[PDB]
RNA sequence: GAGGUAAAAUUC
RNA sequence: AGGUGAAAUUCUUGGAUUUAUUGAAGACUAACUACUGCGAAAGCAUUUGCCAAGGACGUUUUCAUUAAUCAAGAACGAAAGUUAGGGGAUCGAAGAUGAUCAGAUACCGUCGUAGUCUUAACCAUAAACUAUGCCGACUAGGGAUCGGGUGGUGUUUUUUUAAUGACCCACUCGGCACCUUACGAGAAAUCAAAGUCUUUGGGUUCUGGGGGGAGUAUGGUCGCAAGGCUGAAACUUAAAGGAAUU
């Protein structure tokens, strides 16, 4: 259900002698018997995790936690990184670049490992068949096959109906409706092909 | 046919070197092949320097000049008179006209 | 409106398309130590004494 | 006329001839 | 002895899915059935295990990289990035 | 005994912009531009607009108390025709003989490595 | 429709004193109310001035100096430096055709945590008797003539405070250290110190702005 | 060493 | 306010245009830039580091001719265009509008995709022109310049005289070129090469045989596509074309 690998990390109880074994995400790069670092006053090194108030900016990073605490939050899929592209001393903020493109700042007592995550290139290739498209979906949900609204019964679907394959309304269906209206285009700003650029965040 | 020697620039031995972008219409050339006119100037006129020493808070004052390299097209510069035909025989004359 | 006069110290010559305007270096008499090139359409002699409707414009060529 | 738009009056022409060609074989 | 012609490994596949698609295909599936260099030992026996999984036949090592290819053209980028910021913390 | 500030004559082609403003540059006190004096929108450059403009921004420095002044003549520039128009010559006479004390002109125009393409097209603007 | 100049109060400029003749000139700022009260509103603004009227010479009519406010007490405001920016008829009259335009740029950061750009042009001299006329450098002194000035660079900064820095561009110290280390390598000219900007300051310490005036 | 400048105008 | 020869479209107390403080984004490398450099060509102008490559010069070093030119074939090959990601500030094929005009699908004005940028592949044509194959020898004078080297009763920088570097003079190679000439060459314009050619043989590769129809048809091959390469015939005409003078 993850493009990721992930990553038998383990570590020792400081507090009690036994062997406590966590689960990471695996970066590209790193390898088994890498001496993992965790802490605010380890190296910048491809693998290990540093809090973001002592890293400079530019810093590639990933699977980057929005407040400290919640043991990793944003960018955790296969592929993905973050940027950090500039701090602030004063009330210990931190603004970073998400994979979206929405510059959020954030608190740089949050954590996060550095480099990128291990599976990039995933949906680069083309999964012909749709026996490739099952094994690959039955292992997460029951969300395949998708059936088209049209084609089914107006009982099944608001857009169903008529002697033809129409729509027959706006498919763009705004945010304040309530469920069983919201199919289709839910509260688009725009529609169609875009021949435009990315010109806002 | 070939009424000259180079035929449009100061291109020798190089095929291409750097495309530019005339002053007048906004026309790309090369940039041997624009001509170049360094018209400096005063940053005032000849009748306007009489009324600013009068107007001075300075004693003495150095004028400013205004320097500014500006290139031309062949379409805009024989419209515009800086360069104008000439004769056969004259044209292989390269000193600036004094 | 205020008047002032100038008197013509130097004529350069005639400057239009049809050849009606006069290129005229008038010299003020409230200011003898100051001039400025004026254009003008009719006959102009030296020395004599003209009424400038604008006291301050520079005169440039007509084409 | 031409001797530039001259030879795409003939590109264009290629274009339309082999596709009146290709739905006949 | 070459038998076909251009498809080589999407042929399997045979006349289906395409042109242009099985040809994206053939691009990311010489790169991901390769035999790849070892940094470790630098012997030739590296074998894909799973997606980002890459294990080595001798030695017993296992590095995690790319899907398709041991290291990608993005985590190229970002290895040089840390060799450079890491030169200018220790001098 | 003198109080300072800078005029930034920005003379362009087809109008002439004339605002007296502080040593600081935040404050902009009377802007009179060559468009307000004449109803032809063609006149815009001429010399005599620009003399009409310049002297009703040096009638409200006098109501003010600004009595020098350091103008600074500025063309277009960046990727435009980087000369200074008709209305710049006439814009440092007619102030400086209405009454101001001019001091330290000099050019302002931005002149940069070239870059971002030069409107008009490759082969030229043409008639 | 009410005229804004009776709410606009006057406020002097009083430069440092790295040099004479502290008074600037003055500003308009409304008056000490609320909402956006005056003493806010002078968080910073630049004043693009040459150093020409401070000294009273005139050999040093093309080196602007920026003064941004930093302080307000008593119906007056202080200031510190901001920036030594040259004119731009100078550089214009620096360039001429036949000759080689060098130029050389470092980042260093002095003896506090002043983060600075400094910039260096120098042009190649016409030595006395040469018959010919455009004497081009080498195009390998260029990388070794740039190579003495960014040590010299961060000899005079990195060894010394802004306001050892600031007292030392005007009597052009720098300029004559490059020339008696690079005539061994190449005849000069015309060594200047272009540019000068702060990327960052670090606090907000009174005691180094109240002792540059008092 | 600097010194003005674009309307339209097709055929036998 | 924008704008043009003149205009209108457009933006404007929603306070535009302008002024200052910054910040972000990509692109590009002004002035210096030169009858100047490098690369087989296309081409290549910010700094520094790393990684290799090359010409010229110097050489009382080496191998011993290992060479010269080139069907088939291979590498590279501006721009535009194609496929898949990232970027997408300007400019901006299509397109929408504002004028001009008899008409204006245009020139001009404004806005704006594809494109311009980059990675990974393709395509591989240009007035890809110096419209001038390459290698070798000989024939004519002159002033400059780039790169290397050798001589000075040299100049300057100098701490104590130096040594270098810069510069000057003289000479010699390898350059990009230029100027004056015609013994020579050409139909002429012109050319140190297009010269040493009827007093027509240094080695060698490619192309052309009146103008059209044809760079078209068909066939083969290459390419994802647009296309590239190879390439006629029927028929028709007696002129087409070059240089120069009035
Ligand atoms: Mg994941
Ligand atoms: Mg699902
Ligand atoms: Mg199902
Ligand atoms: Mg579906
Ligand atoms: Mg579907
Ligand atoms: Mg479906
Ligand atoms: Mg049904
Ligand atoms: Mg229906
Ligand atoms: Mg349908
Ligand atoms: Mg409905
Ligand atoms: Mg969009
Ligand atoms: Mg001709
Ligand atoms: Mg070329
Ligand atoms: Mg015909
Ligand atoms: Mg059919
Ligand atoms: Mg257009
Ligand atoms: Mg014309
Ligand atoms: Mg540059
Ligand atoms: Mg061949
Ligand atoms: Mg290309
Ligand atoms: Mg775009
Ligand atoms: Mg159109
Ligand atoms: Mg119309
Ligand atoms: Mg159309
Ligand atoms: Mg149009
Ligand atoms: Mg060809
Ligand atoms: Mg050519
Ligand atoms: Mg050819
Ligand atoms: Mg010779
Ligand atoms: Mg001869
Ligand atoms: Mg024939
Ligand atoms: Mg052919
Ligand atoms: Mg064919
Ligand atoms: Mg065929
Ligand atoms: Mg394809
Ligand atoms: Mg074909
Ligand atoms: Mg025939
Ligand atoms: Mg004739
Ligand atoms: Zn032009
Ligand atoms: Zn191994």
């Not at chain 1, 309304?169 to 509260?187: E, F, M, N, P, Y």
């Not at chain 7, 202080?78 to 980042?107: C, P, Y």
């Not at chain 7, 005007?170 to 900007?197: M, W």
Request: proline share 4%.
């Amino acid at each position: 259900g993850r493009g990721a690998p992930l990553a038998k990390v383990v570590f020792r109880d400081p507090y009690k002698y036994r062997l406590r074994e966590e689960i990471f995400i695996a970066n590209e790069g790193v390898h088994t018997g890498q001496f993992i670092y965790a802490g605010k006053k380890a190296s910048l090194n491809v693998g290990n995790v540093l809090p973001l108030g002592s890293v400079p900016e530019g810093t590639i990073v990933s699977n980057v936690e929005e407040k400290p605490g919640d043991r990793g939050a944003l960018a955790r899929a296969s592929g993905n990184y973050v940027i950090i592209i500039g701090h602030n001393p004063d009330e210990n903020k931190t603004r970073v670049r998400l994979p979206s493109g929405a510059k959020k700042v954030i608190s740089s007592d949050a954590r996060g490992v550095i480099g990128v995550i291990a599976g990039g290139g995933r949906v680069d290739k083309p999964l012909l068949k749709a026996g490739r498209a099952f094994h690959k979906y039955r292992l997460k949900r029951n969300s395949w096959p998708k059936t088209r609204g049209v084609a089914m019964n107006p009982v099944d679907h608001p857009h169903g109906g008529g002697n033809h394959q129409h729509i027959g309304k706006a498919s763009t269906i705004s945010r304040g409706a309530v469920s069983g209206q919201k199919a289709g285009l839910i509260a688009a700003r725009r529609t169609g092909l875009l021949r435009g650029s990315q010109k806002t965040q | 046919p070939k009424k000259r020697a180079s035929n449009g620039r100061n291109k020798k031995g190089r095929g291409h070197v750097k495309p530019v972008r005339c002053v007048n219409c906004s026309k790309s050339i090369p940039k041997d092949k624009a001509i170049k006119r360094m018209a400096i100037r005063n940053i005032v006129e000849a009748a306007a320097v009489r009324d600013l020493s009068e107007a001075s808070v300075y004693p003495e004052y150095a004028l400013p000049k205004t320097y500014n390299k500006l290139h031309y097209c062949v379409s805009c510069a024989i419209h515009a008179r800086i360069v104008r035909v000439r004769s056969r025989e004259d044209r292989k004359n390269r000193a600036p006209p004094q | 409106t205020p008047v002032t006069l100038a008197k013509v110290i130097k004529v350069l010559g005639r400057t239009g398309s049809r050849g009606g305007v006069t290129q005229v270096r008038v010299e003020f008499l409230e200011d003898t130590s100051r001039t400025i090139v004026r254009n003008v359409k009719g006959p102009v002699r030296e020395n004599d004494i003209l009424v400038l409707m604008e006291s301050e414009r520079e005169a440039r060529r007509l084409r | 006329m031409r001797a530039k738009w001259r030879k795409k009056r003939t590109r264009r022409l290629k274009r339309k001839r082999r596709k009146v060609r290709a739905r006949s074989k | 002895a070459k038998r076909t012609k251009k498809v080589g490994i999407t042929g399997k596949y045979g006349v289906r899915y395409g042109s242009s698609l099985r040809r994206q295909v053939k691009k990311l599936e010489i790169q991901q059935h390769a035999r790849y260099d070892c940094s470790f030992c630098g012997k030739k026996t590296v074998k894909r295990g799973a997606a980002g999984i890459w294990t080595c036949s001798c030695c017993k090592k296992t590095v995690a990289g790319g899907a398709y290819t041991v290291s990608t053209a993005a985590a190229a980028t970002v290895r040089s990035t840390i060799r450079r910021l890491r030169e200018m913390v220790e001098a | 005994s003198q109080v300072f500030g800078v005029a930034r004559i920005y003379a362009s082609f087809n109008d002439t912009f004339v605002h007296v403003t502080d040593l600081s540059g935040k404050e902009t006190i009377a802007r009179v531009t060559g468009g307000m004096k004449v109803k032809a929108d063609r006149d815009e450059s001429s010399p005599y607009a620009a003399m009409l403009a310049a002297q009703d921004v040096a009638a409200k420095c006098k109501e003010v108390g600004i009595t020098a002044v350091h103008v600074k003549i500025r063309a277009t520039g960046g990727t435009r025709t980087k000369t200074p128009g008709p209305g710049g010559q006439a814009a440092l006479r007619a102030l400086a003989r209405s009454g101001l004390r001019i001091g330290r002109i000099e050019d302002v125009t931005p002149v940069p490595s070239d870059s971002t393409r030069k409107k008009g097209g490759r082969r030229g603007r043409r008639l | 429709v009410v005229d804004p100049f009776t709410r606009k109060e006057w406020f002097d400029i009083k430069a440092p004193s790295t040099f004479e003749n502290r008074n600037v000139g003055k500003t308009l700022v409304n008056k000490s109310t609320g909402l956006k009260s005056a003493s806010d509103a002078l968080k910073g603004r630049v004043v693009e001035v040459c150093l020409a009227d401070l000294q009273g010479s005139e050999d040093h009519s093309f080196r602007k100096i920026k003064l941004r406010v930093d302080e307000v007490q008593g119906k007056n405001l202080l200031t510190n430096f901001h920036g030594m920016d040259f004119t731009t008829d100078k550089l214009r009259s620096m360039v001429r055709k036949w000759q080689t335009l060098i130029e050389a740029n470092v980042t260093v950061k002095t003896s506090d945590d002043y983060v600075l750009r400094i910039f260096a042009i120098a042009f190649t001299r016409k030595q006395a008797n040469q018959v010919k006329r455009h004497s081009y450098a080498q195009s390998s002194h260029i990388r070794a003539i740039r190579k003495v000035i960014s040590e010299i660079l961060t000899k005079e900064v990195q060894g010394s405070t802004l306001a050892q820095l600031t007292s030392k561009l005007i009597p052009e110290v720098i300029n004559k250290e490059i020339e008696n280390a690079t005539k061994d390598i190449f005849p000069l000219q015309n060594i200047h110190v272009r540019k000068v900007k702060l990327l960052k300051q670090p606090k907000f310490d009174v005691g180094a702005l109240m002792a540059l005036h008092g």
